[PDB]
Structure formats: C-alpha cells, structure tokens
Amino acid sequence: GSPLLQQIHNITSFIRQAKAAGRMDEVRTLQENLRQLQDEYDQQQT
C-alpha cells in the first residue's frame, strides 16, 4: 500500500513537471509507468 502510493505520488509529480516543460516523450512513458503501478496498487487493495 503506502510505499506504492509514495511511488505513485512521485510519478504524478514528475508528469506535471514534464508537461510544464513541454517534454512529450517523457510524459508518455511516465504515464504508462503510472498506469501499471496504479493497477498493482488497486489489485492489492481489491
């Protein structure tokens, strides 16, 4: 739970910063990293 949530918080922040700097490749790969970790977090709780 909580450690995974920390990772999720951090990738979410990195996506915000990458969008603000107009770095598209970085945004798209990080969005896929986030999507995979969010499913892992949800399944562990589900």
Curated annotation (Swiss-Prot):
Where's it found, cell-wise? Answer: Cell membrane; Early endosome membrane
What disease does the Swiss-Prot or TrEMBL record associate with this chain?
Kariminejad neurodevelopmental syndrome: An autosomal recessive disorder characterized by global developmental delay, progressive muscle weakness, facial dysmorphisms, ophthalmoplegia and intellectual disability.
Protein role: Rab4/Rab5 effector protein acting in early endocytic membrane fusion and membrane trafficking of recycling endosomes. Required for endosome fusion either homotypically or with clathrin coated vesicles. Plays a role in the lysosomal trafficking of CTSD/cathepsin D from the Golgi to lysosomes. Also promotes the recycling of transferrin directly from early endosomes to the plasma membrane. Binds phospholipid vesicles containing phosphatidylinositol 3-phosphate (PtdInsP3). Plays a role in the recycling of transferrin receptor to the plasma membrane.
Assembly, in brief, is: Interacts with EHD1, RAB4A, RAB5A, RAB14, RAB22A, RAB24 and VPS45. Binds simultaneously to RAB4A and RAB5A in vitro. Interacts with RAB4A and RAB5A that has been activated by GTP binding.
What protein name applies here? Rabenosyn-5
What range of the parent protein does this fragment cover? Answer: 458 to 501 of 784
